[PDB]
Design a protein around this ligand. Structure first.
Ligand SMILES: NC(=O)c1ccc[n+]([C@@H]2O[C@H](COP(=O)([O-])OP(=O)(O)OC[C@H]3O[C@H](n4cnc5c(N)ncnc54)[C@H](OP(=O)(O)O)[C@@H]3O)[C@@H](O)[C@H]2O)c1
Ligand SMILES: O=C(O)C1C=C(O)[C@@H](O)[C@H](O)C1
Length: 500
């Protein structure tokens, strides 16, 4: 509905002087407005303090004095609380957020007293779930009926499929609407506002100044997700996984899309049930997906058509939605990525028999030489016979001297930084050691291997390679290889990052 979504920065410092400094930082960062959370102020002298904030703030102001009964911090007289909000309006506030429960009474009290450049936001918070479209419509209607200028609804995501309902509300409600879904599983609702008609989204000054679960930083909205470039026609892509917060796919693909001016946006997709997810987002708005742990196998089954390579491997890490009919096509870029990465580094001992293990095993055979060691023996066995090559995860420790080791399990992946699939005593037997885990870049395994005298190949080499191949599949444009290497070096080098 109407204009692109604004970016509002929550201001919660416990003193007036600190809030003033925060409004300045919000400006520096690129926010469009700030939400002053008055209920977080330790000491508060209404007239004096409100006067100061309004005078010194470089950005439009939105005042909120949230009470404990609506998830806020304020306790005490209700009339006093309301007097403060009215006082804010009188002094020049650009907006005030008033709770639905008392919005009727409030809006009546200011009838014919509203300044020219002043709008009243009426909000509702649901800390349990995201109601049906039927119930959301009734909520919108109730809020409109109070005389609100802007409708604000915040729900909670029990499952990622819940977000689709909020997009329907922001996209079709004929009234300015701020619609957000809280929780990691609802993050997408905070990023794609400009495509689905949302009036505003909240971005934080920093990762520690969060006012509600799931809020991203202003910096990431602008520079990582390319917020300003998102519009009604932008195609949506994402990394499907569980967990998925460690993924850097959104960093590299959004940079690349921007560089070649491709109208697309890439986000994190925390998925519990793959089947329900694909069914919930089958529209042409969702054009493609990357798939990581542990949905690579399930992805294969959900595809209408599977590339010969993906089929022989038994796993899919790339899904494309054909604009023609609207069916899903499956591909596998993991094989080429891992094999090419290893060869460049130079009997392959593959640790793990899941999606990545299957691809690396297959490809290793295609090149000539393969042993599969897995926690769950049966899987390693099944795989070994599938490509003519099994080893018990325990026998791997005491298992030639110029062999190559390739870990494809999630052992060592953040935050399990001290896990390693094998004893460093067996490393001296390998010439090269590869690790698919790329977060962190240097796992305990690669570290002890480097100390074992062997040559190492980090998962980042495999990551960039499989990623530029996905770009080509998604956009139909030649893989900009050199570009992806540059993007990863410049923007994807920081460790311990979680997007949630
Ligand atoms: N950088 C890249 O390009 C790239 C590409 C692909 C995958 N990866 C990484 O490699 C990992 C696996 O992805 P995936 O799709 O193949 O997941 P799967 O879920 O497809 O593979 C998971 C594997 O690790 C599991 N596992 C969990 N804890 C284990 C433990 N403590 N000891 C032994 N195995 C354990 C499974 O063991 P069981 O079979 O016994 O259950 C299994 O072999 C992820 O961390 C991912 O980030 C990186
Ligand atoms: O974003 C990630 O972590 C990814 C990880 C691997 O599983 C790739 O196969 C995916 O395509 C992307």
């Amino acid at each position: 509905v109407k204009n692109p979504s604004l970016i509002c920065a929550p201001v919660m410092a416990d003193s007036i002087d600190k809030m003033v400094i925060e409004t300045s930082k919000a400006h520096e960062l690129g926010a469009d407005l700030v939400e002053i959370r008055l209920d977080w102020l330790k000491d508060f002298n209404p007239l004096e303090d409100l006067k100061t904030i309004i005078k010194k703030s470089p950005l439009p102001t939105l005042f909120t004095y949230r009470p404990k009964w609506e998830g806020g911090q304020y306790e005490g007289d209700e009339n006093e609380r309301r007097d403060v909000l009215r006082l804010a309006m009188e002094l020049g506030a650009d907006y005030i957020d008033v709770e639905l429960q008392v919005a009727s009474e409030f809006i009546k009290s200011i009838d014919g007293k509203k300044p020219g450049k002043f709008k009243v936001i009426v909000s509702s918070h649901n800390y349990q779930n995201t109601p049906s479209v039927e119930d959301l419509d009734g909520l919108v209607a109730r809020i409109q009926q109070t005389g609100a200028d802007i409708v604000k609804i915040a729900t909670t995501a029990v499952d990622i499929a819940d977000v689709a309902r909020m997009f329907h509300i922001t996209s079709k409600a004929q009234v300015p609407t701020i619609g957000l879904v809280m929780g990691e599983r609802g993050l997408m609702s905070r990023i794609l506002c400009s495509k689905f008609g949302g009036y505003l989204t909240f971005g934080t000054l920093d990762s520690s100044k969060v006012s509600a679960p799931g809020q991203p930083t202003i910096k990431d909205l602008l520079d990582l997700y390319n917020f300003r470039r998102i519009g009604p026609d932008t195609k949506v892509y994402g990394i499907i996984g569980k967990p998925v917060s460690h993924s850097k796919s959104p960093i590299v693909h959004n940079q690349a899309f921007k560089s070649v001016d491709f109208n697309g946006v890439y986000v994190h997709l925390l998925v519990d049930n793959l089947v329900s997810f694909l069914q919930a987002y089958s529209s042409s708005d969702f054009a493609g997906f990357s798939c990581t742990i542990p949905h690579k196998e399930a992805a294969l089954q959900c595809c209408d058509e599977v590339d010969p390579l993906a089929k022989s491997i038994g796993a899919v890490n790339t899904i494309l939605r054909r604009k023609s009919d609207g069916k899903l096509l499956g591909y596998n870029t993991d094989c080429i990525g891992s094999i090419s990465a290893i060869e460049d580094g130079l009997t392959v001992v593959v640790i793990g028999a899941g999606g990545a293990g299957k691809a690396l095993a297959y490809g290793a055979k295609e090149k000539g030489a393969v042993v599969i060691a897995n926690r769950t023996y049966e899987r390693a066995l099944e795989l070994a016979e599938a490509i003519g090559g099994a080893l018990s995860l325990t026998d791997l420790d005491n298992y030639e001297d110029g062999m190559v080791l390739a870990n494809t399990t999630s052992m060592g992946m953040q935050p399990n930084v001290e896990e390693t699939p094998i004893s460093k005593d067996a490393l001296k037997h390998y010439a090269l050691v590869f690790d698919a885990v790329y977060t962190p870049r240097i796992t305990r395994l690669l570290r002890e291997a480097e100390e074992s005298g062997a040559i190492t190949v980090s998962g980042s080499e495999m990551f960039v390679r499989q990623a530029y191949e996905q770009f080509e599949i998604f956009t139909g444009l030649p893989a900009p290889k050199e570009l992806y290497w540059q993007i990863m070096s410049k923007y994807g080098s920081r460790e311990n990052l979680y997007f949630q």
